[PDB]
Amino acid sequence: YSFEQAITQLFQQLSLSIPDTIEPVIGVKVGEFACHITEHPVGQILMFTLPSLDNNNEKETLLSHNIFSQDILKPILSWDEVGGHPVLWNRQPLNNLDNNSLYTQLEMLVQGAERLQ
Amino acid sequence: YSFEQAITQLFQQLSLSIPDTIEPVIGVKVGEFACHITEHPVGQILMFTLPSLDNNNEKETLLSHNIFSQDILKPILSWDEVGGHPVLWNRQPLNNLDNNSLYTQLEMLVQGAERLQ
């Protein structure tokens, strides 16, 4: 129940009602952004959103967002070939979570999403 | 010395001589690919190489490589703005390493690099 427990803690931090059963994929709304939270692979919390890009910029500028940084929660800009839309996502292990770990991941994903616009 | 110890194990698995001191950044050659291994941030093993891309493909095709998968070691294609070259990289925690963990990361990075060509 690390996933169920992790989501329960996040929901309390977002002031959301806690469903009696919690399975992926879990959606949460943060400001303008619909975000999706799953466990994938096992032991990893994966969060993603579908951003509203600025692709009047070259390959180099969109790929430039994806350089590694000091923060492993910095989101990665990808394209979903199967659905024809950008996908922005980040990931961290479920076992190394502080109490606010999912909240931080969600905040980093959304800050990444806001930057893209 | 998790970094020193991790590199020592990798070097034995690559049949490389072990230097008396081991600090980032560590370079290793795997087939056609010069790879670079560092600890960044602390507790994370970061590996990267500078790939020889195929950018007659749209933003969507290069960004399509970056979709998440089941393997957290799947490398991410980025651009280094400060140096004007693509950077392919992956990352995993130093604390959750099996004995062959860096070898697997290196193999996943290079397979990603080979795919790009």
* DSSP for chain B, written as a single string: -HHHHHHHHHHHHHT----SS--SPEEEEETTEEEEEEE-STTEEEEEE------SS-HHHHHHTTS--S-TT--EEEEETTTTEEEEEEEEESTT--TTHHHHHHHHHHHHHHHT-
Task: Identify the CA nearest to B74 among candidates B36, B115, B114, B112.
Answer: B112
Angle, CA B72 vertex, CA A7 and CA B29 arms, to 5°: 160
Tally the domains of chain A. 1
Please list, in sequence order, all residues whose beta carbon lies within 8 angstroms of the beta carbon of residue B35, skipping any fewer than 6 positions away: B27, B28, B29, B47, B48, B49, B106, B109, B110
Q: What is the least distance, in Å, from the CA of A108 to any CA of chain B?
A: 16
The two three-digit tokens of residue B74, written as one number: 């799947």
User: Do the Cβ atoms of B63 and A78 come within 8 Å?
Assistant: yes
**A63 contacts in chain B (CB < 8 Å):** 62-63, 77-79, 86
End-to-end CA, chain A: 36
- Answer positive or negative: Cα dihedral of B1, B2, B7, B8: positive
Q: Of B68, B81, B89, which has the smallest distance from its Cβ to A68's Cβ?
A: B89
Helix A2-14 crosses helix A101-115 at what angle (to 10 degrees)? 60
Way it was determined? X-ray
Task: Identify the CA nearest to A77 among candidates B60, B83, B87, B111.
Answer: B60
| Euclidean distance between CA atoms A44 and B71, whole angstroms | 10
Quickly list DSSP for B38-49.
Answer: EE-STTEEEEEE
Strand order in the sheet with A33-39: A26-30, A33-39, A44-49, A85-93, A76-80
**Which element (helix H / strand E) includes A101?**
helix A101-115
User: Do the Cβ atoms of B76 and A86 come within 8 Å?
Assistant: no
| Euclidean distance between CA atoms B10 and B92, whole angstroms | 14
Does the beta carbon of A48 lie under 8 angstroms from any beta carbon of chain B?
Answer: yes
C-alpha count within 13 angstroms, C-beta hemisphere, residue A61: 9
Q: Of A41, A67, A70, which has the smallest distance from its Cβ to B41's Cβ?
A: A70
End-to-end CA, chain B: 36
Q: For A4-15, b where at least 16 C-beta lie within 10 A, e where not — what string?
A: eebbbbbbeeee
- Answer positive or negative: Cα dihedral of B55, A112, A37, B39: positive
| Euclidean distance between CA atoms B84 and B86, whole angstroms | 7
| Euclidean distance between CA atoms B59 and A79, whole angstroms | 9
CA dihedral B117, B48, A81, B62 (to 10 degrees): -60
**A87 contacts in chain B (CB < 8 Å):** 67-68
Contact A66, B78 (CB under 8 A): yes
Residues composing chain B: 117
What's the domain range around A59?
1-117
| Euclidean distance between CA atoms A45 and A47, whole angstroms | 7
Q: Where are the beta strands (DSSP E) in chain A?
A: 26-30, 33-39, 44-49, 76-80, 85-93
